[PDB]
Ligand SMILES: *[C@@H]1O[C@H](CO)[C@@H](O[C@@H]2O[C@H](CO)[C@@H](O[C@@H]3O[C@H](CO[C@H]4O[C@H](CO[C@H]5O[C@H](CO)[C@@H](O)[C@H](O)[C@@H]5O[C@H]5O[C@H](CO)[C@@H](O)[C@H](O)[C@@H]5O)[C@@H](O)[C@H](O)[C@@H]4O)[C@@H](O)[C@H](O[C@H]4O[C@H](CO)[C@@H](O)[C@H](O)[C@@H]4O)[C@@H]3O)[C@H](O)[C@H]2NC(C)=O)[C@H](O)[C@H]1NC(C)=O
Ligand SMILES: *[C@@H]1O[C@H](CO)[C@@H](O[C@@H]2O[C@H](CO)[C@@H](O[C@@H]3O[C@H](CO[C@H]4O[C@H](CO[C@H]5O[C@H](CO)[C@@H](O)[C@H](O)[C@@H]5O)[C@@H](O)[C@H](O[C@H]5O[C@H](CO)[C@@H](O)[C@H](O)[C@@H]5O)[C@@H]4O)[C@@H](O)[C@H](O)[C@@H]3O)[C@H](O)[C@H]2NC(C)=O)[C@H](O)[C@H]1NC(C)=O
């Protein structure tokens with residue numbers, strides 16, 4: 001195919017806003033989580049339209065100031081994670097011990113339009129919950145990645161000591177949660193890429209936990225058992241490398257095991273043998289048209305499965321992480337005909 005892939009803008013939010021992650025509903029609508037100015041889920045209805053309707057689903061202020069990740073559990077139910085944050089500044093740290101997991105339930109006829117929302121569990125001993133992925137064989141349970149500052153504080157943040165990365169399981173029926181994998185440098189950051197996270201987005205495919213690390217360039221996978229624990233010898237495997245700040249990723253389209261991952265102001269495709277290609281954004285003729293991509297997911301309707309919907313949070317190409325211009329957006333990239 002010709003690169004860069006075709007792309008179009010679906011929607012911009014206001015200056016100061018930040019769209020952080022995305023889940024596509026069985027009906028094809030997009031659900032996106034925001035981190036600023038508030039922790040909300042917005043829906044983009046019928047996103048294949050030139051001008052789709054964009055509507056607030058729910059502001060989770062009762063429990064949190066920001067949302068981070070979203071992931072589907074059982075059909076048309078979703079878990080979001082979030083916490084309180086010291087400010088809406090782009091560099092604000094979270095407030096320690098305030099993380100939570102909450103549920104949006106669109107299942108059933110009463111909830112199909114307006115979901116039922118609830119608090120699932122508080123996570124006061126987590127550091128920063130990030131990505132959410134259901135166990136494919138038991139979708140009422142999710143894994144949740146967890147990494148950022150060990151001692152987050154009000155600005156100015158001075159002690160940037162990172163907590164070691166870890167992965168939680170959460171039973172959304174009972175609310176029970178525990179750490180299932182921790183203490184591996186593949187989960188960690190040493191700020192090789194500047195202040196950032198180690199493990200960031202996660203997905204689960206067959207019996208493999210996959211994740212990207214935002215500091216060391218690697219996409220990893222780990223063999224897991226039925227409860228989410230590493231099968232011994234519990235050693236992560238590098239599946240791909242690129243010297244870029246990853247954020248989140250997906251497999252697709254449909255059944256393909258290509259990884260489509262967001263990196264630094266650019267979008268990448270990664271073959272299962274580790275070949276990485278820049279398909280959109282910086283490093284293509286797109287240049288700076290999509291600054292700050294944060295996550296991506298393929299369409300689910302019969303007529304847009306090859307469309308990769310991409311969330312992002314910058315209105316201009318950032319260089320200094322301390323002087324960025326946040327602006328949430330969602331774009332759509334047509335991957336039709338891409339192959340290695
Ligand atoms: C992955 O690897 C990690 C690292 O090993 C594992 O985590 C450890 O798990 C241990 C076992 O569960 C935990 O041990 C328990 O600790 C409890 C107290 O935890 C509280 O305090 C600690 C220490 O806080 C000090 O140090 C911090 C780090 O330097 C610092 O940020 C903090 O401010 C504190 O500093 C002050 O104090 C130190 C002296 O310690 C001074 O040096 C310093 O200057 C300051 O004045 C903290 O890390 C933790 O967050 C928490 O706040 C104890 O209460 C437990 O004791 C009970 O149980 C014991 C049996 O285990 C028993 O003997 C005892 O009688 C009690 O009944 C217990 O010792 C440990 O906290 C974890 N450490 C870390 C760093 O997280 C982890 O489990 C591994 N993961 C997996 C999945 O395997
Ligand atoms: C949402 O936030 C927006 C910021 O992200 C904000 O838009 C900004 O508004 C301010 C004031 O309203 C404008 O400030 C004015 O800038 C002009 C000069 O503008 C020209 O130069 C600037 C800076 O150029 C240098 O820096 C850039 C990167 O920083 C380099 O690439 C470059 O090489 C230079 O060294 C540049 O940002 C401008 O670009 C915009 O405008 C042109 C058309 O004029 C477009 O082609 C371009 O794509 C872009 O839209 C421009 O070339 C100066 O003379 C004035 O004194 C004043 O300082 C900002 O330019 C503007 N920035 C952007 C990116 O739009 C929105 O107003 C805000 N919205 C709301 C509702 O608040």
Ligand SMILES: [Ca+2]
Nearest residue numbers: 200201247248
């Ligand atoms: Ca992320």
